Design a protein around this ligand. Structure first.
Ligand SMILES: CCCCCCCCCCCCCCCCCC(=O)OC[C@H](COP(=O)([O-])OCC(O)COP(=O)([O-])OC[C@@H](COC(=O)CCCCCCCCCCCCCCCCC)OC(=O)CCCCCCCCCCCCCCCCC)OC(=O)CCCCCCCCCCCCCCCCC
Ligand SMILES: CCCCCCCCCCCCCCCCCC(=O)OC[C@H](COP(=O)([O-])OCC(O)COP(=O)([O-])OC[C@@H](COC(=O)CCCCCCCCCCCCCCCCC)OC(=O)CCCCCCCCCCCCCCCCC)OC(=O)CCCCCCCCCCCCCCCCC
Ligand SMILES: CCCCCCCCCCCCCCCCC[C@@H](O)O[C@H](CO[C@H](O)CCCCCCCCCCCCCCC)COP(=O)(O)OCC[N+](C)(C)C
Ligand SMILES: CCCCCCCC/C=C\CCCCCCCC(=O)OC[C@H](COP(=O)(O)OCCN)OC(=O)CCCCCCC/C=C\CCCCCCCC
Ligand SMILES: CCCCCCCC/C=C\CCCCCCCC(=O)O[C@H](COC(=O)CCCCCCC/C=C/CCCCCCCC)COP(=O)(O)OCCN
Ligand SMILES: CCCCCCCCCCCC(=O)SCCNC(=O)CCNC(=O)[C@H](O)C(C)(C)COP(=O)(O)O
Lengths: 459, 104, 178, 67, 175, 110, 124, 128, 62, 80, 55, 88
């Protein structure tokens, strides 16, 4: 597994020893090659994981997450080099260093065998993200956003640490293989109830769960483009991965402790999806669609069935790709008109025909058009929820209807109608932006032909 | 926004808005791709009474027609081999009760 | 849509608009031309019956009762011209109207075709550049200190002058741009 | 083909369009007449409707009210 | 074809009626079938036979992997991690094999339904009966394990079921 | 239904194009002789739609109405179906009358 | 239908119920009833792949019609006699069902009448 | 004389049926002139930048900025916990959660007690 | 050029699909399943040469 | 192209329902000043038009002639 | 239906003008279904999506 | 194809044709530059009917604010040319 880690670490001295006008080229090429190397982890077994060493292992759940993480870095570098043009050389290298450190932390987080090491890396991912948001964000709110990002997460994860070192003191180990094999039921007691809460709330805040999702519309909106791309595509999935990993110790306590979270998720799906209908900020609309999509992953993980776990894995990957593409698409317009108001620039299909096609495809994948993997994950979760209770079809059905409404609305407001008369600085699309959209959308469509690669360990 | 004059020279023709004018709190609700509050030929509540009455009447008469169905003056359709007992699912090791049809 | 609106409509304007609207809806009800001619002459007679009323209270009351008559008797599906605001071709060609400033972003290979068109465009751009300060000066001098009372714009009063704020009216895309 | 606007007169017509329209209307009417002449039962039925009142009480197994 | 075993994927003997024309009119389907054979099927068979001659020049084999039988979870001690690991791997392989057994039975059922036409409700009784038994056994074996299933949870489920059966059998013997 | 409904929409499109994108029947006058082929096609389509005997429409729709009459059916549904059958001929008549009969009602530049 | 009016507006106890019918034994008035004959065997119908609804005492004529349609395929106007025979057989089946309806109606109007007349001699 | 038309929220009163446009004071005319003047100055201010050759970019519209700011960032600083606000928050935020909890818990309790007594017909239910 | 369209748009696609169905799709069991052919009284089988008996002495009500 | 407008002095309301409108309006003390403008809708090939049943039987005559000749031919040819 | 519709259509040639029935208004405005169902539910949903869900 | 490229002379011809078909205005007296009120002695109500007749002739709707001002056939021709983008 060091054959991926060490090349990623070499991106730092390579970036710092590069010419002033060659950092973007070198970083992009070598991060793409690291993605190529990362593709080898998709060769998974049917029975157990790829146990590289005592420290690192790879499973059918973490391999697609690793591939998405490595694939996202070149796209972030491509999306960042436009608005960082006037920046000094050393600050450009510092921004690229922040991105490389984030990738390194995420790669180790997804493959750590022991839960304390996983916790340390999963918390270390906060520092580069906060620095990115609060140093390179554009507005004065970016400071407050940073605080919201910092303290929502930590207030959730500080109990988790206390739980973890507690568990090792009673079971003897925090190794995930040992934890899974030597698993024992959780009794029905107040102490076990609070241990269950300490093991779960940290991940719930990362998803985030409706009710503790306030930090997200601030952090994603105020962040720079690469910050929001990594926040939506990978950092939200840390909660899903951690919940999937930690659920084994939780049973049979999860059957009754999951009710408040299932109610919050199944209602906040409707709440945030409807919030998207009345949103004057385009980037804020895209951010809220993420909460609406992750409510479904929370439901799938809480109900604890093989179909739900498969659906949650597929939906996490598909949402990562689609939300990253949507944030980039909004940034293309922002770098033209310098405002995130959705109705400021209209009728753009007339002026930018191919970027309109990109918008249409992104909106189609957002509303889970078959046979996209967005739809595969959504439908698997809906089927498992129907098994859990038939009445769920009403809530699930309603969410689907609303999701299509605010997606196409987002399409109709920005692309159709007539272009505003005063704006006259709308330049033709650059090759960089078009390629950035294509490198988002082509892997998404290609994953339809081999969905077993993104369906997790329950396939 | 549909109620405003379409023959005026709006700065924004599609939205029917003028640059610098105060914007209604619910503009995105009223953008005329959406909720319309234009005056109608038939006043509100006149339309509600007629529509609800028509739907309620249709439902009541469908229920009545279910109570008093329509049919033709015939007996049941007759089928030869124990009312196709073996064909309609099988269970060959039961030998069901003879259903017997005679000429009339 | 070309004339500036006034602060209000006078009584004469209101009754004329009512006459035109009632005639159009009557034509919607009377499909055939002879029947329309008959009832339109009856409508004109009904309007002429009070042509020279001098009691403005009585005239206003009569106009109000006429409005109440029209609203009850209006056609729920009036005929609309296809390109009129309610018609079936109202904004059909707006997707084809492209602003002329887009031509500035054409690649030089695109501009290599149509050399005469772009030479004429350069002359038009030079003309627009050269007369802007005179138009601004004219507007400032002509308008009152408080500000302009109405949206009416003045014509060019000197010889080599263009009417102020003319570029976007003149360079309208087209009504059938493609 | 080239026909010009005529401004308040009946439009210019060609020979092919009229003969085609008449030919197809005649074809439809011939088809209707032919099928009615050959397949009348598709409209007027083929079998008569039996009147139950014309069936005797012995045809249906009815006793004379005393047994 | 010799590709698959006919005992595990059976079908009836395929009775096909001989053509018995009654009219003197030409059959368009026969003319089209001759055209299809002469224009489509013959070049396809020629290309396929060329491909097969090229294949026969190089011959190599791949072998189905055979796995030894190892002790199951019942023979493992409480905290003997290595025997638990081997038993769990064997149990997972057996679970996959059982899934594919159910898949084979379901394919038989679907093929019967399509083949029999309008008489499927009667002529597919054997396939429906086989699927009912296989489905009942699979449901008894793996139903309700949930995410995070294991051989230990399956053993606990089986023990609970045997305790229920023993109590039900003791109840009947007292009558 | 596919055949004659598609052809009816085609005839409507022909009328609309020949009248400078006008879709209101109140501005279509006497087109019976001005567009003879369109008139023939639309008349045949309306007759097919109305269940005229031996036409394409007849081999299904007339069999449907009998089937409802010869079934254990909701009485209100049967009455509604018969009334709708009458209204079909009603609106076919409306189209033919207001689009092809009478005197021209379209602008003078033909 | 008239039969609907006589039931929904008149006395419904004088007319048969289409769902609960027949209510009298098949030999209540008839002295000797021969069992209805079937021509096509179960195997023939099964081989023919006829619809379950289609497998009615008229099935042999339908089998002949299907065979005739298949044998003279291009000439789709050759199976007129066979279609006529099958339609005649189905017409006979329908009039048999109408006869059953009428028999049940007149049995039911005779039954209550005879009991109420037996009660008519029991007043005193 | 005729059936009267009464306005509603989603079908408003027409201008020609509004008695305000028929009882006009000199002050009403002064107000209309003032409104026209405000609209006119705004139109002239817009058209001066719109027609400007030199200008390249987006004309910034203070009304749009005020609208978005009021719809997002001005709301919490102008919030007061009042019995109406507290009641609406509690109802609209808490009531649906317990309503759905009750519905789902009742349904699942019924389903589990049916499974326990062996009357559900779970045959062919291999996938969950 | 006379009939080039009918070979690059019909003959070539039907060559690939026929090759695909005959030698790859039908290699797996139950991939192409056909409705059993109808059998009528009097038919002759091409496989066993069996003759189906005729239909039991019609009432001949004519 | 290259065509001009017909003379405006030919549009007379005479013989058309516009005359009837004019008489009915004269019997009321009014006049119709736009009648001649509509006159072209009744003048040329628009002067006469078919009724509903005549439109329905647009090709009945020719089709009937073909039908009767075919029946006459086949009925006597069937007597071989 | 043919006869009744044709007769009612020929009635339009007469020189009489009268105001429409309430049944005609119901038919022409599509049972008022779009005028009610495209205004009341959309308004209430879009109003709650902002007044309570967002604010 | 579609409608021919309508020209200025055609617009003037059609406007004068429609005016000459109006019973109120005599053909000999009418001129392109004739005022509808001073020259022809026509009331405001009468003027509205001319505008509607022009709408029916050219098949498009002229707004009331725009319509009232048109007092000469040349004015109507210029308005129609401006709307249809007619430059010869
Ligand atoms: C069934 C189709 C058969 C396809 C045969 C093979 C085709 C392979 C194409 C694969 C997709 C290409 C990637 C998408 C980005 C395109 C890049 C681009 O900009 O091109 C511009 C290029 C140049 O045009 P231009 O003049 O410069 O354009 C100027 C403007 O941009 C103006 O541009 P525009 O207005 O022309 O817009 C582009 C155009 C096309 O652009 C797109 O929409 C591309 C994306 C399609 C929607 C995907 C998102 C929705 C979620 C479903 C995802 C399915 C993925 C399937 C697997 C894909 C694997 C790659 O828009 C549309 O036509 C409407 C799109 C909505 C499609 C609705 C149907 C969806 C379901 C279809 C069935 C899917 C499963 C099929 C199998 C089912 C069982 C047999 O245009 C093209 O070359 C054509 C574009 C391709 C259209 C394909 C539409 C069908 C795609 C089906 C999925 C692939 C199936 C392949 C296997 C066989 C099936
Ligand atoms: C063969 C055996 C059976 C024989 C049956 C006996 C023979 C036939 C019996 C008579 C059948 C009706 C014949 C005349 C139909 C009416 C046509 C007419 O002149 O309309 C006048 C008038 C509208 O005329 P208008 O407004 O002066 O028109 C102005 C211009 O003409 C505007 O001009 P426009 O260009 O807009 O044109 C308007 C349009 C028409 O104008 C309209 O929009 C109104 C037309 C409505 C006709 C409705 C007929 C079917 C109604 C079914 C409704 C089911 C029940 C719904 C109840 C909802 C209650 C909420 O004209 C047309 O296009 C043609 C109209 C249709 C003619 C052909 C109709 C054929 C189907 C009906 C006959 C079926 C016969 C076969 C039955 C076989 C059964 C086995 O409407 C009516 O007064 C009567 C309409 C019929 C129903 C009215 C019932 C009263 C409604 C309120 C009742 C009280 C409710 C209390 C509350 C309860 C709450 C629980
Ligand atoms: C907005 C987003 C926030 C995140 C949402 C987190 C939700 C956390 C909710 C925790 C789920 C359940 C917690 C404990 C389980 C039952 C709690 C209680 O209501 O049930 C009864 C508990 O009994 C009593 O009710 C005791 C609880 C009463 C005192 C607790 C106050 C709860 C009020 C709600 C506070 C709001 C929670 C969030 C704080 C910010 C059960 O009856 P009983 O048979 O006796 O006890 C059995 C439990 N045993 C086995 C451990 C013994
Ligand atoms: C399970 C869910 C069941 C559905 C419950 C009700 C769903 C309510 C949806 C709320 C959506 C609100 C947001 C939409 C955005 C606003 C919008 O769409 O604009 C309104 C827009 C514009 O108006 P127009 O009339 O089309 O044009 C006028 C312009 N001149 O109109 C619409 O599209 C509104 C559509 C709302 C439909 C709601 C009514 C449908 C409910 C049907 C219930 C009965 C089901 C039938 C069952 C049949 C049995 C098998
Ligand atoms: C962004 C906001 C997220 C908020 C997350 C905070 C909630 C975390 C859940 C509680 C955290 C503390 C749990 C302690 C770790 C559990 C380890 C454990 O098992 O210890 C228990 C002890 O458990 C406790 O003591 C916990 C009691 C609570 C102490 C601190 C109170 C915190 C507030 C409680 C309610 C809030 C939790 C839910 C809020 C959700 C977020 C809004 C039993 O051990 P023994 O003592 O050995 O018992 C067996 C032998 N006698
Ligand atoms: C289908 C249609 C529905 C029915 C609609 C019902 C409408 C009501 C019918 C009767 C109309 C009236 O009451 S009429 C309105 C009642 N009041 C008056 O008429 C006041 C006097 N008007 C003048 O003095 C002006 O000069 C003027 C007359 C405008 C001419 O102006 P010009 O000459 O300088 O252009």
């Amino acid at each position: 597994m060091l054959k991926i880690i060490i090349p990623t670490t070499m991106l730092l001295p390579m970036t710092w020893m590069s010419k002033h006008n060659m950092i973007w080229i070198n970083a992009t090429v070598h991060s793409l090659l690291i993605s190529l190397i990362s593709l080898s982890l998709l060769n998974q077994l049917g029975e157990n994981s790829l146990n590289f060493s005592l420290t690192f292992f790879s499973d059918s759940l973490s391999a697609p997450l690793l591939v998405l993480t490595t694939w996202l870095l070149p796209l972030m570098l491509m999306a960042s080099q436009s608005h960082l043009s006037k920046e000094t050389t050393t600050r450009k290298k510092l921004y690229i260093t922040m991105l490389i450190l984030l990738q390194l932390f995420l790669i180790m987080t997804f493959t750590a065998t022991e839960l304390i090491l996983f916790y340390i890396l999963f918390e270390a991912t906060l520092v580069p993200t906060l620095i990115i948001i609060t140093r390179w964000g554009n507005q004065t709110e970016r400071l407050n956003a940073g605080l919201y990002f910092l303290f929502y997460t930590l207030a959730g994860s500080l109990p988790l640490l206390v739980a973890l070192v507690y568990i090792q003191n009673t079971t003897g180990s925090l190794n995930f293989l040992i934890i899974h094999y030597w698993s024992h039921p959780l009794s029905n007691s107040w102490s076990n109830i609070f241990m269950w809460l300490a093991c779960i709330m940290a991940f719930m805040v990362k998803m985030p769960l409706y009710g503790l999702h306030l930090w997200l519309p601030k952090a994603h909106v105020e962040a720079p483009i690469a910050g929001s791309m990594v926040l939506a595509a990978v950092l939200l999935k840390l909660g899903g991965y951690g919940m999937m990993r930690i659920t084994t110790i939780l049973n049979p306590l999860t059957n009754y402790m999951a009710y408040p979270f299932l109610m919050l998720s199944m209602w906040g799906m409707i709440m945030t999806s409807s919030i998207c209908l009345r949103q004057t900020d385009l980037k804020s609309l895209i951010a809220y669609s993420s909460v609406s999509h992750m409510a479904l992953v929370i439901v799938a993980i809480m109900i604890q069935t093989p179909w739900s776990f498969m659906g949650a894995t597929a939906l996490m990957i598909a949402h990562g790709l689609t939300s990253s593409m949507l944030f980039c698409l909004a940034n293309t317009n922002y770098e033209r008109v310098h405002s995130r108001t959705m109705i400021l620039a209209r009728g753009l299909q007339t002026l930018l025909p191919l970027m309109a096609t990109w918008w249409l495809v992104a909106s189609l994948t957002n509303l889970a058009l078959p046979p996209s993997i967005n739809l595969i994950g959504e439908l698997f979760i809906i089927t498992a929820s129907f098994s859990w209770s038939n009445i769920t079809i009403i809530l699930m059905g309603m969410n689907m209807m609303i999701t299509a409404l605010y997606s196409l609305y987002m399409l109709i407001t920005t692309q159709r109608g007539k272009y505003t008369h005063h704006i006259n600085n709308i330049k033709p699309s650059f090759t960089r932006e078009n390629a950035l959209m294509a490198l988002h959308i082509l892997p998404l469509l290609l994953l339809t032909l081999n969905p077993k690669m993104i369906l997790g360990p329950l396939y | 926004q549909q109620e405003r004059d379409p023959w005026y020279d709006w700065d924004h023709p599609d939205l029917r808005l003028n640059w610098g004018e105060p914007i209604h709190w619910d503009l995105d609700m009223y953008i005329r791709n959406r909720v319309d509050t234009s005056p109608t030929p038939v006043s509100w509540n006149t339309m509600c009474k007629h529509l609800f009455g028509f739907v309620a009447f249709m439902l009541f008469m469908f229920w009545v027609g279910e109570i008093y169905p329509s049919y033709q003056p015939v007996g049941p359709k007759q089928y030869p081999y124990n009312d196709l007992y073996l064909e309609r699912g099988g269970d060959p090791t039961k030998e069901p009760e003879p259903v017997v049809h005679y000429e009339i | 849509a070309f004339s500036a609106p006034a602060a209000y409509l006078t009584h004469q304007q209101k009754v004329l608009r009512l006459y035109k609207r009632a005639l159009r809806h009557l034509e919607s009800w009377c499909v055939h031309r002879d029947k329309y001619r008959y009832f339109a002459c009856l409508m004109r007679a009904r309007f002429d019956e009070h042509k020279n009323e001098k009691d403005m209270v009585k005239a206003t009351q009569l106009l109000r009762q006429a409005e109440e008559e029209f609203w009850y008797g209006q056609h729920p599906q009036p005929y609309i011209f296809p390109e009129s605001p309610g018609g079936t071709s109202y904004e059909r060609y707006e997707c084809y109207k492209v602003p002329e400033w887009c031509l500035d972003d054409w690649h030089p290979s695109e501009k290599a075709m149509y050399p005469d068109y772009f030479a004429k465009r350069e002359q038009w751009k030079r003309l627009r550049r050269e007369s802007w300060e005179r138009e601004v000066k004219q507007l400032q001098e002509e308008t009152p200190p408080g500000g302009p009372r109405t949206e009416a714009l003045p014509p060019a009063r000197k010889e080599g002058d263009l009417p102020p704020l003319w570029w976007h009216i003149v360079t309208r895309p087209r009504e059938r741009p493609m | 083909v080239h026909i010009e606007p005529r401004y308040r007169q009946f439009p210019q017509l060609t020979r092919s369009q009229l003969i085609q329209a008449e030919f197809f209307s005649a074809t439809m009417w011939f088809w209707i007449l032919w099928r009615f002449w050959h397949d009348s039962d598709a409209v007027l039925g083929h079998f008569p409707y039996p009147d139950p009142s014309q069936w005797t009480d012995e045809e249906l197994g009815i006793l004379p009210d005393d047994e | 074809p010799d590709s698959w075993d006919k005992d595990v994927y059976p079908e009836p003997p395929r009775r096909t009626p001989a053509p018995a024309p009654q009219t003197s009119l030409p059959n368009p389907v026969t003319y089209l079938t001759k055209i299809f054979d002469l224009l489509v099927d013959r070049p396809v068979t020629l290309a396929r036979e060329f491909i097969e001659q090229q294949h026969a020049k190089n011959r190599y084999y791949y072998y189905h992997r055979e796995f030894r039988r190892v002790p199951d979870i019942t023979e493992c001690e409480e905290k003997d991690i290595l025997c638990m690991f081997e038993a769990e791997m064997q149990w997972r392989r057996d679970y996959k094999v059982d899934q594919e057994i159910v898949n084979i039975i379901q394919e038989r059922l679907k093929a019967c339904q399509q083949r029999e036409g309008e008489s499927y409700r009667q002529n597919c009784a054997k396939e429906l009966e086989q699927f009912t038994q296989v489905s009942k056994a699979f449901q008894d074996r793996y139903s309700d394990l949930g995410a995070h299933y294991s051989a230990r949870k399956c053993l606990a489920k089986q023990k609970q079921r045997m305790l229920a059966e023993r109590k039900a059998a003791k109840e009947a013997a007292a009558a | 239904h596919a055949f004659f409904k598609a052809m009816l929409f085609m005839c409507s499109g022909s009328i609309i194009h020949s009248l400078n994108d006008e879709q209101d029947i109140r501005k279509m006058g006497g087109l019976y002789k001005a567009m003879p082929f369109t008139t023939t096609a639309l008349i045949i389509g309306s007759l097919a739609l109305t269940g005229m005997p031996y036409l394409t429409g007849f081999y299904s729709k007339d069999l449907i109405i009998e089937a409802v009459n010869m079934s254990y059916t909701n009485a209100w549904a049967l009455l509604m179906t018969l009334i709708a059958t009458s209204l079909t001929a009603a609106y076919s008549t409306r189209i033919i009358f207001f689009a092809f009969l009478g005197k021209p009602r379209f602008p003078p530049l033909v | 239908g008239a039969h609907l009016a006589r039931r929904y507006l008149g006395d419904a106890s004088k007319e048969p119920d289409p769902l609960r019918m027949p209510t009298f034994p098949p030999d209540y008035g008839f002295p000797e009833r021969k069992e209805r004959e079937m021509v096509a065997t179960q195997q023939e119908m099964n081989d023919a792949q006829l619809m379950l609804q289609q497998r009615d005492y008229c099935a042999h004529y339908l089998i002949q019609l299907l065979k005739c349609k298949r044998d003279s395929f291009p000439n789709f106007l050759a199976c007129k006699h066979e279609q006529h025979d099958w339609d005649y057989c189905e017409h006979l089946d329908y009039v048999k069902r109408m006869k059953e309806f009428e028999r049940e109606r007149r049995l039911l109007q005779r039954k209550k009448r005879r009991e109420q007349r037996e009660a008519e001699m029991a007043r005193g | 004389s005729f059936p009267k038309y009464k306005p509603s929220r989603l079908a408003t009163l027409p201008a020609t049926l509004d008695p305000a446009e028929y009882d006009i004071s000199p002050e009403t005319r002064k107000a209309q002139a003032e409104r026209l003047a405000i609209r006119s100055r705004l139109k002239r201010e817009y058209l001066l930048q719109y027609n400007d050759p030199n200008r390249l970019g987006v004309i910034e519209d203070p009304a749009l900025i005020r609208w978005t700011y009021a719809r997002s960032a001005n709301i919490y600083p102008n919030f007061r916990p009042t019995p109406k606000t507290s009641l609406l928050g509690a109802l609209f935020g808490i009531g649906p959660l317990f309503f759905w909890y009750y519905v789902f818990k009742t349904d699942r309790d019924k389903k589990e007690k049916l499974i326990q007594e062996g009357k559900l017909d779970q045959t062919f239910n291999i996938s969950y | 050029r006379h009939s080039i369209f009918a070979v690059t748009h019909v003959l070539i696609p039907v060559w690939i699909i026929h090759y695909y169905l005959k030698y790859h799709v039908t290699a797996k069991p139950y991939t192409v399943v056909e409705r059993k052919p109808r059998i009528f009284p009097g038919d002759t089988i091409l496989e066993t040469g069996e003759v189906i008996p005729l239909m039991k002495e019609f009432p001949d009500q004519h | 192209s290259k065509m001009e407008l017909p003379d405006y002095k030919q549009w007379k309301i005479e013989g058309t329902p516009l005359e009837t409108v004019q008489e009915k309006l004269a019997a009321r003390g009014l006049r119709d000043p736009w009648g001649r403008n509509e006159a072209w809708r009744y003048s040329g090939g628009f002067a006469n038009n078919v009724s509903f049943v005549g439109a329905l039987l647009k090709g009945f005559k020719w089709g009937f002639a073909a039908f009767v000749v075919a029946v006459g031919a086949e009925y006597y040819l069937e007597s071989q | 239906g043919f006869m009744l519709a044709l007769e009612l259509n020929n009635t339009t040639y007469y020189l009489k003008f009268k105001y429409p029935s309430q049944t005609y208004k119901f038919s022409n405005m599509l049972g008022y279904y779009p005028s009610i169902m495209h205004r009341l539910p959309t308004y209430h949903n879009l109003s709650m999506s902002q007044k309570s869900a967002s604010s | 194809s579609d409608a021919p490229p309508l020209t200025l002379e055609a617009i003037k011809d059609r406007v004068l044709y429609v005016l000459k078909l109006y019973d109120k205005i005599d053909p000999e007296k009418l001129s392109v530059n004739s005022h509808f009120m001073k020259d022809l002695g026509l009331d405001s109500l009468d003027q509205v009917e001319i505008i509607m007749a022009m709408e029916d002739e050219f098949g498009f709707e002229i707004p009331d604010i725009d319509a009232e001002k048109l007092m000469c056939p040349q004015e109507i021709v210029d308005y129609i040319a401006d709307k249809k983008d007619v430059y010869e």
